[PDB]
Design a protein around this ligand. Structure first.
Ligand SMILES: [Mg+2]
Length: 218
């Protein structure tokens, strides 16, 4: 049986989409750029901060220096961090708490494999820190998803090889990263985004100990 489970944060344990959106919109409003609405915000989901900022600047053909760019990105981040102060245990996705409990009582290791610079903070706010045997520090990895680095680091951090592990993810790039680490991927979402050569569940309520075991057995 698998010895560890490697969790992504956003889209698996929780998300902070309403807060990211609110931060970008506030920044657009502040600098006077029209068009940053819910619909357009879709084009920023999963995109880096710099690339999101550029897409927003592009709505007004607006041109800025390096320092101005850096400052606008900082301001969007400052907004975002203020907004996430209200993350609570109610933000935990369905099934996840029970899953973490079952994993722990069966002595299966639990690690975070997230690019989020606010991972430890967010796990504290949701009261999940005591379940986590480790958190891979995204600052200490050479390359981000779909590079496998972070899943490799997560597995190693809990004393296992990736090949002893299951990875859970909601993004194509994350699925590829788990694949290339050597761990077994189980996605949440749809085959159109994730691929159809991996097991996928519709939502996180389907992530149960019992189910991960059947998947490991096949
Ligand atoms: Mg994700």
């Amino acid at each position: 049986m698998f010895k560890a489970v490697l969790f992504d944060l956003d889209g698996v344990i929780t998300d902070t989409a309403e807060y990211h959106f609110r931060a970008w919109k506030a920044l657009a409003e502040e600098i006077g750029i029209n068009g940053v609405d819910r619909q357009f915000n879709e084009q920023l989901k999963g995109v880096s901060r710099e690339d999101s900022l550029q897409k927003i600047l592009d709505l007004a053909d607006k041109k800025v220096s390096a320092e101005e760019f850096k400052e606008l990105a900082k301001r969007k981040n400052d907004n975002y961090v203020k907004m996430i102060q209200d993350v609570s245990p109610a933000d935990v996705y369905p099934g996840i708490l029970q899953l973490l409990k079952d994993l722990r009582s069966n002595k299966i290791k639990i690690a975070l494999a997230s690019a989020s610079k606010n991972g430890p903070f967010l796990l504290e706010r949701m009261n999940l820190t005591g379940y986590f045997d480790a958190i891979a520090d995204p600052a200490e990895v050479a390359a981000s998803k779909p590079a496998p680095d972070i899943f490799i680091a997560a597995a190693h951090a809990v004393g296992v090889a990736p090949s002893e592990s299951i990875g859970l993810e909601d993004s194509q790039a994350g699925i590829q990263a788990i694949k290339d680490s050597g761990a077994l991927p189980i996605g949440v979402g749809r085959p159109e985004d994730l691929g159809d050569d991996i097991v996928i569940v519709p939502d996180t309520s389907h992530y149960t100990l019992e189910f991960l075991k059947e998947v490991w057995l096949q």
